Amino acid sequence: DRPYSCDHPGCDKAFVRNHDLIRHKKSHQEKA
């Protein structure tokens, strides 16, 4: 049931694994 469904504003990428959410969540940050 998508144990990793990030819910960040402007998001649109579901996940099933864990690390993915970790490498994906840190993306909502980015520099600049």
Q: What residues line the site for Zn ion (CB under 5 A)?
A: 6, 8, 11
- In the bound complex, what is the minimum distance in angstroms from residue 4's beta carbon to Zn ion? 10
Between 11 and 16, name the residue whose CB sits nearer to Zn ion: 11
- In the bound complex, what is the minimum distance in angstroms from residue 22's beta carbon to Zn ion? 11
The first and second tokens of residue 1, run together, are 């049931």
- In the bound complex, what is the minimum distance in angstroms from residue 18's beta carbon to Zn ion? 14
DSSP conformation letters of 1-32: --SB----TT----BSSSHHHHHHHGGGT---
